[PDB]
Ligand binder design. Structure first.
Ligand SMILES: Nc1ncccc1CO
Length: 330
């Protein structure tokens, strides 16, 4: 089997991407944020505290003939950005792009933090990291990908995120029309439950490539590219008037600037992030200070290859016995 679904940016800055997912019988379609940095499939639901729902589509298990309470099971998650949600668990049929899993754990939110309530366009999360990070207790549950894997033509999914445009998530096959050149594969460590890999270095604009190992994770649910402070300072030093602002919470730059590209290494291959991808617009409406798409990872404890980076590439998440990541230009 295979599945193919279009992913659409929620706003004009590509802060996140939503992908329609069918849950239950008859289908309830919710728009979920596919997140390769976490391992819970959770939804706004009929059980969500009413004051914490503001425009989201909700899953109502009582209206699904295939929904079953997973008795006793609870979940609670906290994310890199301070947001959280918690609740109880149903099993139900879940379909993405034509690919169906029966008996998928659907985590129903009773509580969500303010950042979720405020995002009316995101009806929940579909986690695509390793199932070792799943928060269901007392019985940990599998991700949608882990449940689908055995049925798939190939044990893979691909992320093809658009710049200010829709893209695609594919399950079970590699669309050889979706990328240019070849795919370079690189080793993954699953020791922390993430798609953790080692970049081979970077370049700023037309500058020389610096060979240096940068461990990090490929995280579709993280907007920006977080890299060591040395690398980030080297990038922003090429933009006149850029500075790190403690008041704003990162590097900002004049919105009159033309930003240089950023290149990262994947083995002997190179992925180029155009400068425009690094512009996250005014810090506040009407400001002439713009927020940068490349930020320091110092304090976060890990480097994150978020959407600023992955949207520049066709990315293969290879879930074979020995997982690997693949990157191609597009
Ligand atoms: N990957 C993620 N998923 C959900 C919330 C936050 C992040 C990253 O901080």
């Amino acid at each position: 089997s295979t599945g193919s679904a279009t992913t659409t940016p929620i706003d004009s800055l590509d802060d996140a991407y939503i992908t329609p997912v069918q849950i239950g019988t008859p289908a309830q379609t919710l728009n979920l944020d596919f997140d390769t940095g976490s391992s819970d499939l959770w939804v706004f639901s009929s059980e969500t505290t009413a004051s914490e729902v503001d425009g989201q589509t909700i899953y109502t298990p009582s209206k699904s003939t295939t929904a079953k309470l997973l008795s006793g099971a609870t979940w609670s998650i906290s994310y890199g950005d301070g947001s959280s949600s918690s609740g109880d668990v149903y099993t139900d049929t879940v379909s993405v792009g034509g690919l169906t899993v029966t008996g998928q754990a659907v985590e129903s939110a009773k509580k969500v933090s303010s950042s979720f309530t405020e995002d009316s366009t995101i009806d929940g999360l579909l986690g695509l990291a390793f199932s070792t990070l799943n928060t269901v207790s007392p019985t940990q549950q599998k991700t949608f990908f882990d449940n689908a894997k055995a049925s798939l033509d190939s044990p893979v999914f691909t992320a093809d995120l658009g710049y200010h445009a829709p893209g695609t998530y594919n399950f079970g096959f590699i669309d050889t029309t979706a990328y240019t050149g070849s795919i370079t594969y690189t080793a993954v460590s699953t020791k922390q439950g993430f798609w953790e890999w080692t970049s081979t270095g970077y370049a700023v604009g037309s500058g020389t490539f610096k060979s240096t190992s940068i461990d990090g994770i490929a995280d579709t649910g993280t907007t920006l590219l977080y890299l060591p402070a040395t690398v980030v300072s080297a990038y922003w030093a090429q933009v006149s008037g850029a500075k790190s602002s403690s008041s704003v919470g990162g590097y900002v730059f004049p919105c009159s600037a033309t930003l240089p590209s950023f290149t990262f290494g994947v083995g002997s291959a190179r992925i180029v992030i155009p400068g425009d991808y690094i512009d996250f617009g005014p810090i506040s409406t009407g400001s002439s200070s713009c927020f940068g798409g490349i930020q320091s990872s110092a304090g976060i404890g890990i480097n994150i290859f978020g959407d600023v980076a992955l949207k520049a590439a066709f990315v293969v998440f290879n879930g074979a016995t020995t997982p690997t990541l693949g990157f191609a230009s597009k």
